[PDB]
Amino acid sequence: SLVELGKMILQETGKNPAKSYGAYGCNCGVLGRGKPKDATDRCCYVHKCCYKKLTDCDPKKDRYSYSWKDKTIVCGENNSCLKELCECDKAVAICLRENLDTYNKKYRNNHLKPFCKKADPC
């Protein structure tokens, strides 16, 4: 669940998950999928693609366990679907940190419905 999502993102990026990626671009906090606007927006994209393929456990709500060992997110050994869920969450936090270079507050908007195009399909 997002409670674990937030813990991941703060641990990887150092940034506050809600404050930073709350409403960023066309993926990023928000609900649904669009043509990315930058690479951080692109991370969040892959993540929803990732969530989609999971169709057994409620990715957006159901919980799991990970460990912060030796500065790393190692997924616990949950069930087939919960493990990929953990995995998807790890990827995005990893992905987001790697892209802090290009992060730009710009893509939050002022904070109003942006111009989002239909996403490329997963």
Add this chain to the structure above:
Amino acid sequence: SLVELGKMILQETGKNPAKSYGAYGCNCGVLGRGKPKDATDRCCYVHKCCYKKLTDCDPKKDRYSYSWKDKTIVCGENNSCLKELCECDKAVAICLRENLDTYNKKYRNNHLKPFCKKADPC
């Protein structure tokens, strides 16, 4: 200051610096150096010598600035003293993480303190 130290330990280790090392063994979270009981103990022993050599800086109280960058603690410039102070803390946050395999709550002085022998000359 203890504010920054606390933050580093948490960041590297993932534990409350007060719960976990608040009073641990001969040298963690307590006063003076003693002959260390375990590897976690020897972290804080080494850490206190790092402080011994710090004249010109109130290790216990001297605010400095560092950053979390690509999952690493990068110390802000500041003066040599403060630089050194920041180093000591990093190295202790790190040494601590490294030696979680043998953290022994047996030595959690707070449950029955520990008889401590005399320390070596730093």
